[PDB]
C-alpha cells in the first residue's frame, strides 16, 4: 500500500507465495546412516567387551 503504483507488488507477492518451496530438504542419509551405525556399534561393542574382559583378567 505504501507503493501506490508499484504495479509489481501483486507480481512480487505472487512470486513470493509461488516460491514457498524454493527446494526441499535433503535427508538422503537412509543407508549411509545405517552402515555408519553398524560399523560404529560393532567396533564399540568389541571395544567394550574387550575392556570388560581386561578388567576381569
Amino acid at each position: 500500500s505504501v507503493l501506490k503504483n508499484t504495479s509489481v507488488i501483486d507480481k512480487i507477492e505472487s512470486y513470493v507465495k509461488q516460491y514457498k518451496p524454493v527446494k526441499i530438504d535433503a535427508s538422503k542419509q537412509l543407508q549411509v546412516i545405517e552402515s555408519f551405525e553398524k560399523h560404529a556399534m560393532t567396533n564399540a561393542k568389541e571395544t567394550e567387551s574387550l575392556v570388560s574382559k581386561e578388567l576381569k583378567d
Binding site: 555408519f36 560399523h39 560404529a40 560393532t42 567396533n43 564399540a44 568389541e46 571395544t47 574387550l50 575392556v51 581386561e54 583378567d57
Partner: protein, 85 residues
Amino acid sequence: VSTLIPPKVVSSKNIGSAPNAKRIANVVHFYKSLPQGPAPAIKANTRLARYKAKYFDGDNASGKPLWHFALGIIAFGYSMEYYFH
C-alpha cells in the same frame, strides 16, 4: 569429514602393547604360582639321607654340620693308623 567412531577403534588394537605383554607375563607368572609356599618336601631318611636332610639342612648351617665329617673321618683314620702303623 563427517561422523565416525574415534573411540571404537579400540577393536583394532588394545591399549598398551607393552603393558599387554607385561600383563600376559604377569598372568602366567601369578597363576602358575603356589597358593602359599606349596610343595616343600623337606624330610628324607634312608641310610645317608637321614644325615642329609638333618645335617645338611639349613635350620642351623652352623660350623658343626661340616665338623661331623671331620669327627667321622678322624674315627676312620685312627683305625686306619691302628691297622697300618
